[PDB]
Symmetry: C3
Subunit: 416 residues, 3 copies
């Protein structure tokens, strides 16, 4: 193959080829509910809910798997009575205290029979809740990664975060049987060739078993696949055009056309189920190879034949039959008899125009943001600590006085 | 430029549609922040933030590693005898009785102080903590939701190096009110952006991940469609037809193109059918051969027809809901095996409408109309909240009342005590 | 059709054919917010929040549909009393204390009643709220998984198993409710995700989404069979030939032709086309494919581009005359009588078939892998040892009982005056 632009054919993006036939099969077990242990069974009510949620997920995948399997397979006396009085007075101050004690005891038992237990329960409920958040973030994450896999019983690609559960810290380690290039796995990701299919579901453990099949690419020696676009071209005052296949191949010193219908284009090569090459008729064969005298050219008489095509950042066109402008509809672009087409470059003309149609360079837009609302956690609800010191301090202060008077009553009681 | 006389020759050209080329793009960055600024001086949600960040790490890291791999490949006292000693003693005893009572008070004004301490040093901070753990939970839910929402909208993009389309809710952050503000660079039709949505032509690739601030950076590529002036595209199906007792069929491309006054075929292969038009990277058209072109333009006597001898050649086709068959070499039964629909040896084919015959018949096969089935629902089970009932308050009044009730009765007696003591 | 392996054409996997034109429309109603019954409005905020979340999800779908419809349409007796007055003043001071105590006590009570009890209930409320949020959050999560792909585009999309889950109750057959469908037919519908659902209408007030499920009804063509065919360069005598043929072939009754399965979708037991994909081949080829092998449009090969080997049913078919086929190692070459056109290499005959050094092995199995969540263990609530003052309280009655006795004593020493 050469440079037969002068005849309107443009061969570009040269690329290698690999055949995907061999593969490694690993199985991945998804466990939907973590081993949960809570002594007092606080997170009990919640576990129950999280399971009914899982069932709504698992059960359908089950019924489906079962269907698939189903098909496939009177003076002293005054002082006397004055004592009796004061005495009866002390006896009542007793029953008084005898009641403050009961009152005080009742308070204790309240605090123990109601308040403390409540505080307890509340915490239990809140421990349970804390678990709900946990399970929920799990179900969330679970579904986001293997959600499309758990939804169909057919093969599917696998997200990066799903592959991340196959290797520890080096993606290469995904293949635990062979050794693989950094390069080779990249072609796998960019192509999403790694496929996953759900094989079974255990309704009791709440686990889904997936079968992933990793392709092992076989590289091909000396094979290159190019893309080709043909445009009309002028020679003297006549316009010609050569229709050719979309892709050309090169195996050793042989060339032919490549049918990439079933393949997938990777970064530096195409990964195919099998060699895509096919033979062209001697004419195209010689034309492409160099003997330009053989090109299957046709005189163009219809507006249908394309007179321009886009190639790697820029346009290729027949500027004789198509009006090519440079940076405005007033700057006509010439093309010497020398060639059959002109390669207008965006470096050359920022806005290259073809028959009025303006083709510019990617225009940056205004930056966008996906942002959540700022959350401020207005702390709990505070309670002012109770204060009785002022009262208790007086009780203890009267108390003392009481003692002093008794002290005095005794030294006065001294009359020997 | 195409005569629909072609119909009489079993060749049907479906609906007309325009064509647009996609070569002008509008790059535009979208920054995803997976964690909001959080304010809580008491650090009551520290444990959740931790939990949340770890959740994001599991999600983000793989995207990160993948981008790195790509970036790499690419680039006792005496006793009382006399009654005055008996009084001295009698009162000396009561003093001790009082001294006992005051001993009892000391014990109570300790029992109370202990309560004022149990409550203050334990019942309170304990309750305070519940609210603090509860604030954490509040933030968890929220944070959990932001994740669930984020993963839904961008989870398809976040999980691949390959380019993907944006969901409606994704695009939602590219405009404030009109879905048009989508493009900032240019001005675009309601029609032009509808073809974009309907086709999922708007695509985005993840560019960089920032593991520290927990943010992903997407590049949205909005394409700008160039409408190809006076170009239409039709889909074309061909059936067999009878003309003078001979049965013919014409093999024709799937699609045809109309450019000005020229015509040919359309290789829509690498293109995408939208609503108003097809959207292709380049012009799909190619040139048919003299015979075929002429045939389609009108010179019906040029059609590369063939005699049907096999049963492979289609004798009917669905187009415009209804059916179009060759009712001569086929038996078209209108509304039930009974009534047969006839076709003069003159015409080419018969166009049967589901309006005339509710259930078209073609040799046993009954092509009917969409039949509506039973309305179905996806509804969550009704929820009801049973806020814990309040706690019957504490009542120690009956006890406090008798308590004060006596304190008076006591004061009384001391009056009488002081009374008799005053008449001495 | 036959056994044309002798000329290098390999007719693979034989499948039947069904066309899909008869559809069964069925509407599905998505309710994003369930009916909530909260008497004391404990979950108010949490609900206002969830809705704010459903809006950031619904709205866009709305704005989207709008754009669409918008476009589509100084003695002893004197001494004795100075001492009793003293005693009384001491009893007075006691009463004063008992008062400051009776006060302090009610105060305690009031606090627990006017500040703690309430505080306990509020906390109880906040939880009921938080519990609702868990629910709502989950619902949102579950629902965005099932229909989130549909809700995000306005083009038709397939439907997940768990999505189909709400069309039937027990048998997956009750999916269609206007006809009766083979278990076989729905499996082809599932295996193909032919069932499509398109978002029809959204309601911003009741937070609901209406979806239309399009359920295809397959019609089966008789005696029709579609085969996949591969062609490889063969070797007859010392000359090397190649016969190029279409990728798919069809068999109808006693006739055969090609098949343009392009617009078609291969299922399990058959292909599901929007219409019969058969076309006729030129006499020569038609004849060739039916036995008359002297009619095969064979071409002499002179390039390495012509396929000399092909993958088939977990094995390889190759021209081991123009290709160097090795069985179980590069030293063991496989031969071929100048007669047969090609050799059918089986992985059972060759664990590792090698074509020109390129190795095609059996499939090895890597290590089982696990996606498991860290073990969660709940450290119970926060427990408070109960309050205990029964010690200090007993030291109270006891002292009163001592006091009671000191009085009983003081009385009798008086009961003996005279
Ligand atoms: C070009 O091809 C023709 C036909 O095969 C041959 O006769 C002629 O000599 C060739 N000339 C070149 C360019 O080698
Ligand atoms: C097919 O082969 C027969 C003999 O098997 C031969 O006589 C005949 O000419 C061939 N058919 C055609 C179309 O000529």
């Amino acid at each position: 193959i050469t440079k037969l632009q002068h005849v309107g054919v443009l061969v570009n993006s040269p690329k290698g080829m690999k055949i995907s036939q061999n593969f490694e099969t690993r199985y991945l077990i998804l466990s939907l509910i973590p081993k949960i242990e809570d002594s007092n069974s606080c997170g009990d009510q919640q576990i129950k809910q999280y399971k009914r949620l899982l069932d709504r997920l698992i059960i359908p995948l089950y019924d489906g798997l079962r269907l698939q399997k189903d098909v496939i397979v009177s003076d002293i006396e005054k002082l006397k009575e004055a004592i009796r009085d004061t005495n009866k007075a002390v006896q009542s101050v007793q029953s008084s205290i005898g009641n403050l004690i009961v009152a005080i005891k009742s308070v204790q038992d309240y605090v123990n029979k109601e308040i403390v237990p409540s505080i307890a329960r509340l915490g239990c409920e809140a421990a349970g809740l804390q678990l709900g958040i946990a399970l929920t973030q799990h179900y969330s994450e679970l579904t986001n990664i293997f959600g499309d896999n758990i939804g169909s019983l057919q093969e599917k690609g696998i997200k990066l975060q799903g592959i991340a559960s196959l290797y520890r810290t080096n993606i290469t380690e995904i293949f635990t049987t062979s050794t693989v290039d950094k390069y080779d796995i990249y072609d796998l990701l960019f192509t999403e060739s790694i496929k996953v299919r759900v094989i079974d579901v255990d309704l009791n453990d709440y686990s889904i078993t997936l079968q992933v099949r990793l392709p092992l690419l076989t590289r091909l020696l000396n094979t290159q696949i190019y893309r080709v676009d043909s445009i009309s071209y002028n020679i003297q005052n006549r316009e010609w055009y050569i229709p050719l296949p979309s892709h050309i191949m090169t195996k050793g010193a042989f060339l032919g056309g490549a049918d990439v219908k079933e393949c997938i284009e990777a970064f530096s090569s195409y990964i195919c189920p099998s060699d895509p090459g096919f033979v062209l008729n001697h004419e195209m064969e010689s034309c492409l190879s160099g003997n330009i005298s053989q090109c299957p050219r046709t005189v163009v008489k219809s507006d249908i034949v394309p007179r321009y095509a886009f190639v790697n950042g820029g346009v290729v066109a027949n500027c004789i039959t198509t009006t090519c402008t440079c940076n405005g509809i007033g700057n006509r672009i010439n093309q010497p008899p020398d060639q059959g087409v002109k390669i207008i470059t965006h470096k050359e003309c920022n806005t290259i125009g073809i028959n009025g149609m303006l083709f510019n360079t990617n225009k940056e837009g205004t930056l966008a943001f996906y942002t959540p609302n700022d959350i401020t956690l207005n702390n709990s609800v505070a309670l002012d600590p109770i204060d009785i010191s002022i009262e208790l301090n007086k009780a203890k202060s009267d108390l003392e006085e009481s003692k002093e008077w008794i002290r005095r009553s005794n030294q006065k009681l001294d009359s020997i």
